[PDB]
A paper describes a structure:
[name], a large protein of 1,863 amino acids, contains an N-terminal RING domain and two C-terminal tandem [name] domains. [name]-[name] domains bind to proteins containing the phosphorylated serine-proline-x-phenylalanine (pSPxF) motif including Abraxas, Bach1/FancJ, and CtIP. Abraxas mediates the interaction of [name] to other components of the [name]-A complex, which include BRCC36, NBA1/MERIT40, BRE, and Rap80. [name] accumulation at DNA damage sites is an important step for its function in the DNA damage response and in DNA repair.
[name]-Ab1p_short without the GFGE residues (YSRpSPTF) complex was then crystalized and solved at 2.5 Å resolution. The pSPTF motif from Abraxas binds to the [name] domains in a similar two-anchor mode using pS406 and F409. The phosphate group of Abraxas S406 interacts with the side chains of [name] K1702 and S1655, as well as the main chain of G1656. The side chain of F409 in Abraxas inserts into the [name] hydrophobic pocket created by L1701, F1704, N1774, M1775, and L1839. As F409 is the terminal residue for Abraxas, an extra salt bridge is present between the main chain carboxyl group of F409 with the [name] domain residue R1699. A notable difference between [name]-Ab2p and [name]-Ab1p_short structure is the conformation of the Y403S404R405 region. Although a similar dimer interface was observed for [name]-Ab1p_short structure, the cross interaction between the negative surface patch (formed by the phosphate group of pS404 and the side chain of E402) and [name] K1671 is completely lacking. [name]-Ab1p is shown to exist predominantly as a 1:1 complex with a small portion forming a 2:2 dimer. Indeed, the [name]-Ab1p peak shifts left to the [name]-Ab2p peak position once the concentration is increased, indicating the tendency of [name]-Ab1p to form higher order complexes at high protein concentrations as observed in the crystal structure. It is likely that at high concentrations, the [name]-Ab1p complex is packed in a conformation that is not stable at low protein concentrations without a contribution from phosphorylated S404.
Numbering used by the authors:
A (entry chain A): 1646 to 1859
B (entry chain B): 403 to 409
């Protein structure tokens, strides 16, 4: 069948979005507020060097191997009144993981070798600023298998379980340290997932590990 | 607005 251009925007003011809306309207490009499997283009606010902030749409964009391109793609296409090529405007990095890590490009090219493949991940709440099912969708897009309960982890030397938590979300008790007594798997911060996705390369769990009381 | 959070 025909999968058609379909955009979402991120990090744009309500104003800048209007320009995109006009752009989408002129060229009859589908524009939506919510990102989906169908979405092909994620238009990010960036600087002159195509570096951008890390938003939910940014992560999901890369994870889905979609076109993650700069807002300049839209404005420049307007200034030339033509549909410019995405390749020229693909974001090269973000503020956090490097300004040219080429995460988006690698994500487009590694859809047969997903980073989280062969892993089972449980997103152990609570979290903030990012719905748990969105985080779960993010890993799922990256080949990881999602697990709801710590007791739902699949056993076997061939399956690797990972528990992901956000320490800042917990309150005044090192509860997150007590998880290890519930099941044996590595407990890592949400940053591990976010860094891995942004670069679209599976980071070593070392720097993200959380001390589990015996 | 209620602009999207950043990580």
């Amino acid at each position: 069948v025909n999968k058609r251009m379909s955009m979402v925007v991120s990090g744009l003011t309500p104003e800048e979005f209007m320009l995109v809306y006009k752009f989408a309207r002129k060229h009859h490009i589908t524009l939506t507020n919510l990102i989906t499997e169908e979405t092909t283009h994620v238009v990010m606010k960036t600087d002159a060097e195509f570096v951008c902030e890390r938003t939910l749409k940014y992560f999901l964009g890369i994870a889905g191997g979609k076109w993650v391109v700069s807002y300049f793609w839209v404005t420049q296409s307007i200034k030339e009144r033509k549909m410019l090529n995405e390749h020229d405007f693909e974001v090269r990095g973000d503020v956090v993981n490097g300004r040219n890590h080429q995460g988006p490009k690698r994500a487009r090219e590694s859809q047969d070798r997903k980073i989280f493949r062969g892993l089972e991940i449980c997103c152990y709440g609570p979290f903030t600023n990012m719905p748990t099912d969105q985080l779960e969708w993010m890993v799922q897009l990256c080949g990881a298998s999602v697990v709801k309960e710590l007791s739902s982890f699949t056993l076997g030397t061939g399956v690797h379980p990972i528990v992901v938590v956000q320490p800042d979300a917990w309150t005044e008790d090192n509860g997150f340290h007590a998880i290890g007594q519930m099941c044996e798997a590595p407990v890592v911060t949400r940053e591990w997932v976010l860094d891995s996705v942004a670069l679209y390369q599976c980071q070593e769990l070392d720097t993200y590990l959380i001390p589990q009381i015996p | 607005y209620s602009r999207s959070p950043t990580f």
